[PDB]
Amino acid sequence: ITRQIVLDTETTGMNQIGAHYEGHKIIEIGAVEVVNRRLTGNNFHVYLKPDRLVDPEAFGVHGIADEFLLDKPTFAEVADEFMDYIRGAELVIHNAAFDIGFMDYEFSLLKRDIPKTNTFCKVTDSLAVARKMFPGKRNSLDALCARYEIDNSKRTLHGALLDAQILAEVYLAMTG
Numbered sequence: 001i002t003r004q005i006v007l008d009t010e011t012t013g014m015n016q017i018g019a020h021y022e023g024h025k026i027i028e029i030g031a032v033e034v035v036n037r038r039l040t041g042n043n044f045h046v047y048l049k050p051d052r053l054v055d056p057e058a059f060g061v062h063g064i065a066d067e068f069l070l071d072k073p074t075f076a077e078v079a080d081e082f083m084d085y086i087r088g089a090e091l092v093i094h095n096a097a098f099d100i101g102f103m104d105y106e107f108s109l110l111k112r113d114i115p116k117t118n119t120f121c122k123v124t125d126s127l128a129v130a131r132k133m134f135p136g137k138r139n140s141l142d143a144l145c146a147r148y149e150i151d152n153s154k155r156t157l158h159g160a161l162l163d164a165q166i167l168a169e170v171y172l173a174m175t176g
């Protein structure tokens with residue numbers, strides 16, 4: 001009856017000062033649907049053309065090459081379906097402010113008066129939840145994988161769908 005969408009993004013990078021997303025772009029969105037504590041398998045996964053370069057640090061994390069993104073859709077091209085997918089759900093995101101910041105930024109660039117994500121989705125920060133559950137402990141997604149015996153062996157490089165799927169498993173266990 002209620003949908004949870006476990007979501008992750010990869011980006012061109014991030015700013016350590018000021019708005020973390022300014023001047024950066026989402027290059028991958030990965031989102032997995034959970035209904036009644038079961039993955040439905042109906043997911044959303046896109047790579048996006050950023051029309052700027054990936055910062056070396058970000059490339060160190062996700063390995064998504066500039067060349068790979070050249071033929072991909074723009075955020076504008078996926079935004080409608082993305083909104084249709086997430087609307088009304090509880091979004092579960094590890095360090096939610098990061099991705100939500102990027103999402104609202106990208107939505108805002110569309111100049112379509114799209115309201116903030118948290119006005120049409122519930123936003124749950126699984127990192128805050130993990131910190132509450134495991135105060136004083138490591139709470140990276142990888143740390144949580146070890147804690148909950150979730151396979152992250154394929155996660156040498158981070159990817160948005162990969163990370164969202166891993167987080168969904170972790171979060172189900174956290175709330176189970």
Ligand SMILES: [Mn+2]
Nearest residue numbers: 008009094163
């Ligand atoms: Mn992430």
Ligand SMILES: [Mn+2]
Nearest residue numbers: 008158159163
């Ligand atoms: Mn990721």
